[PDB]
PDB file of C-alpha atoms and ligand atoms in Angstrom:
ATOM      1  CA  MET A   1     -14.523   2.952  -5.805  1.00 50.37           C
ATOM      2  CA  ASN A   2     -12.485   4.399  -2.949  1.00 50.72           C
ATOM      3  CA  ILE A   3      -9.034   3.835  -1.327  1.00 50.79           C
ATOM      4  CA  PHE A   4     -10.461   1.242   1.049  1.00 52.01           C
ATOM      5  CA  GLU A   5     -12.087  -0.874  -1.603  1.00 52.15           C
ATOM      6  CA  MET A   6      -8.963  -0.510  -3.668  1.00 47.33           C
ATOM      7  CA  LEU A   7      -6.596  -1.782  -0.951  1.00 45.61           C
ATOM      8  CA  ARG A   8      -9.004  -4.517   0.019  1.00 45.75           C
ATOM      9  CA  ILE A   9      -8.793  -5.812  -3.518  1.00 44.32           C
ATOM     10  CA  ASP A  10      -5.024  -5.641  -3.607  1.00 49.16           C
ATOM     11  CA  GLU A  11      -4.292  -7.005  -0.102  1.00 49.96           C
ATOM     12  CA  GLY A  12      -7.156  -9.434   0.546  1.00 51.95           C
ATOM     13  CA  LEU A  13      -8.350 -10.214   4.037  1.00 53.96           C
ATOM     14  CA  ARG A  14      -6.911 -12.862   6.316  1.00 53.83           C
ATOM     15  CA  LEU A  15      -7.909 -13.550   9.897  1.00 55.83           C
ATOM     16  CA  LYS A  16      -4.940 -15.644  10.732  1.00 53.89           C
ATOM     17  CA  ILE A  17      -1.177 -14.750  10.804  1.00 57.06           C
ATOM     18  CA  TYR A  18       0.205 -15.490   7.397  1.00 54.68           C
ATOM     19  CA  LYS A  19       3.233 -14.778   5.384  1.00 54.62           C
ATOM     20  CA  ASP A  20       3.261 -12.060   2.806  1.00 55.75           C
ATOM     21  CA  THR A  21       4.802 -12.256  -0.585  1.00 54.25           C
ATOM     22  CA  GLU A  22       8.130 -11.338   0.933  1.00 55.33           C
ATOM     23  CA  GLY A  23       7.890 -13.974   3.660  1.00 56.75           C
ATOM     24  CA  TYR A  24       6.860 -11.613   6.479  1.00 58.20           C
ATOM     25  CA  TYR A  25       4.408 -12.221   9.227  1.00 62.29           C
ATOM     26  CA  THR A  26       1.152 -10.356   8.391  1.00 63.23           C
ATOM     27  CA  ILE A  27      -2.515 -10.411   9.401  1.00 65.37           C
ATOM     28  CA  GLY A  28      -5.822  -8.770   8.388  1.00 66.25           C
ATOM     29  CA  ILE A  29      -5.636  -6.500   5.373  1.00 66.60           C
ATOM     30  CA  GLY A  30      -1.904  -6.250   4.720  1.00 65.75           C
ATOM     31  CA  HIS A  31      -0.977  -5.208   8.272  1.00 64.92           C
ATOM     32  CA  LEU A  32       2.786  -6.202   8.387  1.00 64.59           C
ATOM     33  CA  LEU A  33       3.454  -7.510  11.856  1.00 70.76           C
ATOM     34  CA  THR A  34       7.195  -8.218  11.886  1.00 69.82           C
ATOM     35  CA  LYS A  35      10.105  -8.790   9.582  1.00 66.33           C
ATOM     36  CA  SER A  36      11.387 -11.348  12.107  1.00 68.90           C
ATOM     37  CA  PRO A  37      11.526 -15.028  11.401  1.00 68.26           C
ATOM     38  CA  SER A  38       9.821 -15.752  14.617  1.00 68.39           C
ATOM     39  CA  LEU A  39       6.250 -16.781  14.637  1.00 71.27           C
ATOM     40  CA  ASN A  40       6.592 -15.922  18.284  1.00 69.73           C
ATOM     41  CA  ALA A  41       7.807 -12.469  17.724  1.00 69.43           C
ATOM     42  CA  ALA A  42       4.712 -12.107  15.395  1.00 67.14           C
ATOM     43  CA  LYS A  43       2.263 -13.450  17.919  1.00 71.54           C
ATOM     44  CA  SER A  44       3.599 -10.980  20.411  1.00 69.39           C
ATOM     45  CA  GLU A  45       3.468  -7.983  18.067  1.00 69.81           C
ATOM     46  CA  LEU A  46      -0.073  -8.955  17.261  1.00 64.90           C
ATOM     47  CA  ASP A  47      -1.349  -8.880  20.897  1.00 63.09           C
ATOM     48  CA  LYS A  48       0.461  -5.623  21.511  1.00 60.74           C
ATOM     49  CA  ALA A  49      -1.402  -4.315  18.368  1.00 60.52           C
ATOM     50  CA  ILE A  50      -4.936  -5.550  19.339  1.00 59.29           C
ATOM     51  CA  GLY A  51      -4.643  -5.237  23.022  1.00 57.34           C
ATOM     52  CA  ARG A  52      -5.569  -8.809  23.857  1.00 57.40           C
ATOM     53  CA  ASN A  53      -4.368 -12.359  23.715  1.00 57.11           C
ATOM     54  CA  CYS A  54      -5.050 -13.388  20.199  1.00 56.94           C
ATOM     55  CA  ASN A  55      -3.088 -16.479  19.684  1.00 55.81           C
ATOM     56  CA  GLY A  56      -2.483 -15.524  16.008  1.00 54.63           C
ATOM     57  CA  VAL A  57      -6.193 -15.045  15.233  1.00 55.28           C
ATOM     58  CA  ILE A  58      -8.327 -11.901  15.086  1.00 56.50           C
ATOM     59  CA  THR A  59     -11.858 -10.913  14.250  1.00 56.20           C
ATOM     60  CA  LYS A  60     -13.082  -9.048  11.036  1.00 58.00           C
ATOM     61  CA  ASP A  61     -13.784  -5.997  13.086  1.00 56.99           C
ATOM     62  CA  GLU A  62     -10.236  -6.087  14.518  1.00 59.22           C
ATOM     63  CA  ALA A  63      -8.857  -6.405  11.021  1.00 61.16           C
ATOM     64  CA  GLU A  64     -10.853  -3.405   9.928  1.00 62.02           C
ATOM     65  CA  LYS A  65      -9.668  -1.447  12.897  1.00 58.13           C
ATOM     66  CA  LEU A  66      -6.117  -2.134  11.954  1.00 60.14           C
ATOM     67  CA  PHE A  67      -6.904  -1.234   8.345  1.00 58.83           C
ATOM     68  CA  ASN A  68      -8.386   2.202   9.262  1.00 57.92           C
ATOM     69  CA  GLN A  69      -5.194   3.016  11.236  1.00 58.29           C
ATOM     70  CA  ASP A  70      -2.850   1.999   8.445  1.00 56.79           C
ATOM     71  CA  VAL A  71      -4.620   4.085   5.811  1.00 59.34           C
ATOM     72  CA  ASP A  72      -4.746   7.089   8.130  1.00 60.01           C
ATOM     73  CA  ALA A  73      -1.062   6.641   9.009  1.00 61.45           C
ATOM     74  CA  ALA A  74      -0.167   6.379   5.307  1.00 55.59           C
ATOM     75  CA  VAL A  75      -2.154   9.492   4.437  1.00 57.74           C
ATOM     76  CA  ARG A  76      -0.529  11.515   7.316  1.00 60.48           C
ATOM     77  CA  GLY A  77       2.854  10.150   6.396  1.00 60.44           C
ATOM     78  CA  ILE A  78       2.527  11.508   2.792  1.00 59.23           C
ATOM     79  CA  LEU A  79       1.400  14.851   4.057  1.00 57.17           C
ATOM     80  CA  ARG A  80       4.443  14.988   6.400  1.00 56.26           C
ATOM     81  CA  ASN A  81       6.967  14.033   3.846  1.00 56.07           C
ATOM     82  CA  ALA A  82       8.755  16.860   1.948  1.00 59.22           C
ATOM     83  CA  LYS A  83       9.260  14.656  -0.987  1.00 60.37           C
ATOM     84  CA  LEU A  84       5.804  13.186  -1.135  1.00 61.68           C
ATOM     85  CA  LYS A  85       3.498  15.997  -0.177  1.00 63.84           C
ATOM     86  CA  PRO A  86       4.093  18.113  -3.278  1.00 64.25           C
ATOM     87  CA  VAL A  87       3.379  15.218  -5.571  1.00 66.24           C
ATOM     88  CA  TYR A  88       0.234  14.479  -3.762  1.00 67.26           C
ATOM     89  CA  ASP A  89      -0.890  18.111  -3.714  1.00 65.44           C
ATOM     90  CA  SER A  90      -0.375  18.215  -7.363  1.00 65.43           C
ATOM     91  CA  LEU A  91      -2.597  15.250  -8.313  1.00 65.64           C
ATOM     92  CA  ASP A  92      -6.248  14.571  -9.066  1.00 66.71           C
ATOM     93  CA  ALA A  93      -8.406  12.430  -6.729  1.00 65.57           C
ATOM     94  CA  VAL A  94      -7.887   9.045  -8.412  1.00 64.94           C
ATOM     95  CA  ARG A  95      -4.169   9.343  -8.891  1.00 65.28           C
ATOM     96  CA  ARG A  96      -3.908  10.380  -5.248  1.00 63.42           C
ATOM     97  CA  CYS A  97      -5.352   6.971  -4.433  1.00 62.24           C
ATOM     98  CA  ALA A  98      -2.543   5.335  -6.408  1.00 57.45           C
ATOM     99  CA  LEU A  99       0.176   6.994  -4.328  1.00 57.77           C
ATOM    100  CA  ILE A 100      -1.546   6.090  -1.041  1.00 55.61           C
ATOM    101  CA  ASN A 101      -1.547   2.549  -2.324  1.00 54.71           C
ATOM    102  CA  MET A 102       2.188   2.479  -2.944  1.00 52.77           C
ATOM    103  CA  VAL A 103       2.826   4.068   0.471  1.00 54.14           C
ATOM    104  CA  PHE A 104       0.697   1.538   2.322  1.00 51.35           C
ATOM    105  CA  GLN A 105       2.574  -1.283   0.530  1.00 48.35           C
ATOM    106  CA  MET A 106       6.109  -0.005   0.518  1.00 50.11           C
ATOM    107  CA  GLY A 107       6.516   2.618   3.213  1.00 50.45           C
ATOM    108  CA  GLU A 108       7.253   6.300   2.719  1.00 51.73           C
ATOM    109  CA  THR A 109      10.869   5.566   2.464  1.00 51.85           C
ATOM    110  CA  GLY A 110      10.419   3.196  -0.523  1.00 53.64           C
ATOM    111  CA  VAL A 111       8.039   5.429  -2.478  1.00 50.97           C
ATOM    112  CA  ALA A 112      10.315   8.313  -1.828  1.00 49.61           C
ATOM    113  CA  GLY A 113      13.013   6.236  -3.660  1.00 50.89           C
ATOM    114  CA  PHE A 114      11.086   6.504  -6.931  1.00 52.50           C
ATOM    115  CA  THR A 115      12.522   9.990  -7.560  1.00 51.13           C
ATOM    116  CA  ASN A 116      12.249  10.026 -11.314  1.00 48.92           C
ATOM    117  CA  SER A 117       8.703   8.630 -11.460  1.00 48.02           C
ATOM    118  CA  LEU A 118       7.588  11.066  -8.772  1.00 49.86           C
ATOM    119  CA  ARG A 119       9.048  13.903 -10.849  1.00 52.46           C
ATOM    120  CA  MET A 120       7.150  12.849 -13.888  1.00 50.86           C
ATOM    121  CA  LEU A 121       3.914  12.468 -11.977  1.00 52.46           C
ATOM    122  CA  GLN A 122       4.418  15.983 -10.812  1.00 54.17           C
ATOM    123  CA  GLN A 123       4.885  17.077 -14.324  1.00 51.17           C
ATOM    124  CA  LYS A 124       1.792  15.184 -15.418  1.00 52.79           C
ATOM    125  CA  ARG A 125       3.747  13.111 -17.940  1.00 56.72           C
ATOM    126  CA  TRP A 126       1.569  10.031 -17.346  1.00 58.31           C
ATOM    127  CA  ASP A 127       2.868   7.581 -19.954  1.00 55.62           C
ATOM    128  CA  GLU A 128       6.481   8.266 -19.041  1.00 53.48           C
ATOM    129  CA  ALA A 129       6.078   7.840 -15.345  1.00 51.00           C
ATOM    130  CA  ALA A 130       4.330   4.470 -15.997  1.00 51.89           C
ATOM    131  CA  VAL A 131       7.207   3.261 -18.069  1.00 52.62           C
ATOM    132  CA  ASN A 132       9.655   4.354 -15.466  1.00 52.09           C
ATOM    133  CA  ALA A 133       7.890   2.908 -12.486  1.00 51.12           C
ATOM    134  CA  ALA A 134       7.867  -0.545 -14.107  1.00 52.36           C
ATOM    135  CA  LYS A 135      11.616  -0.645 -13.913  1.00 52.28           C
ATOM    136  CA  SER A 136      11.621  -1.591 -10.317  1.00 48.80           C
ATOM    137  CA  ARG A 137      12.004  -4.480  -8.047  1.00 51.50           C
ATOM    138  CA  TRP A 138       8.390  -3.673  -6.876  1.00 49.85           C
ATOM    139  CA  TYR A 139       6.975  -4.438 -10.286  1.00 51.90           C
ATOM    140  CA  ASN A 140       9.050  -7.561 -10.847  1.00 49.85           C
ATOM    141  CA  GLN A 141       8.039  -9.006  -7.472  1.00 51.28           C
ATOM    142  CA  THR A 142       4.248  -8.259  -7.529  1.00 51.41           C
ATOM    143  CA  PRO A 143       3.510  -7.591 -11.201  1.00 52.20           C
ATOM    144  CA  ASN A 144      -0.322  -7.848 -11.235  1.00 54.22           C
ATOM    145  CA  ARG A 145      -0.811  -5.416  -8.371  1.00 55.39           C
ATOM    146  CA  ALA A 146       1.986  -3.093  -9.682  1.00 56.33           C
ATOM    147  CA  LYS A 147       0.249  -3.060 -13.139  1.00 56.75           C
ATOM    148  CA  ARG A 148      -3.032  -2.113 -11.502  1.00 57.07           C
ATOM    149  CA  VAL A 149      -1.424   0.823  -9.638  1.00 58.45           C
ATOM    150  CA  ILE A 150       0.551   1.923 -12.654  1.00 58.73           C
ATOM    151  CA  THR A 151      -2.622   1.932 -14.853  1.00 57.35           C
ATOM    152  CA  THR A 152      -4.340   4.051 -12.276  1.00 58.22           C
ATOM    153  CA  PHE A 153      -1.512   6.615 -12.565  1.00 57.86           C
ATOM    154  CA  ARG A 154      -1.448   6.464 -16.373  1.00 61.31           C
ATOM    155  CA  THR A 155      -5.185   6.876 -16.970  1.00 60.35           C
ATOM    156  CA  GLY A 156      -6.626   8.543 -13.976  1.00 62.55           C
ATOM    157  CA  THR A 157      -9.505   6.076 -13.829  1.00 62.71           C
ATOM    158  CA  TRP A 158     -10.561   3.062 -11.838  1.00 62.56           C
ATOM    159  CA  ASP A 159     -10.480   0.825 -14.818  1.00 64.15           C
ATOM    160  CA  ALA A 160      -7.901  -1.676 -13.567  1.00 63.69           C
ATOM    161  CA  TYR A 161     -10.120  -2.347 -10.655  1.00 65.74           C
ATOM    162  CA  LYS A 162     -13.358  -2.864 -12.442  1.00 65.59           C
TER     163      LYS A 162
HETATM  164 CL1  LIG B 201      14.277  -3.201 -13.624  1.00 61.53          CL
HETATM  165 CL1  LIG B 202       0.931  -9.360  -8.044  1.00 62.49          CL
END
């Protein structure tokens, strides 16, 4: 189990523009296209992203290309963030996967808002951080995925995904 297989389970794969759980225009493996209500703004963003006329539809390969960028971008974002980088540095390999997951889903800004939880992860107080992260809009909105991520932080294993 790796970060890619993990995100592919949580995000799924869709070759046609679709709306995410929040209502936003998305495609591929969780690649948010626009927060705009316009299916037209989305179709436009999409062609700018792929470099061709897609007419809201892309190939598997294109979806994987977007996915590799997004994971890379998330990883570099964590390493560039003064709030995130120390947490990351401090964790084992599996737990690190859990934080990339949150970042990919919610943006560096959002994860950075979990101050208390991040502090507990840093202190390796696993159970407490799990209890605290559950008190969030994140968890109430997408509970099954949140639970999976939270278990990964609590235990340090890939259990929730197997
Ligand atoms: Cl709450
Ligand atoms: Cl969910």
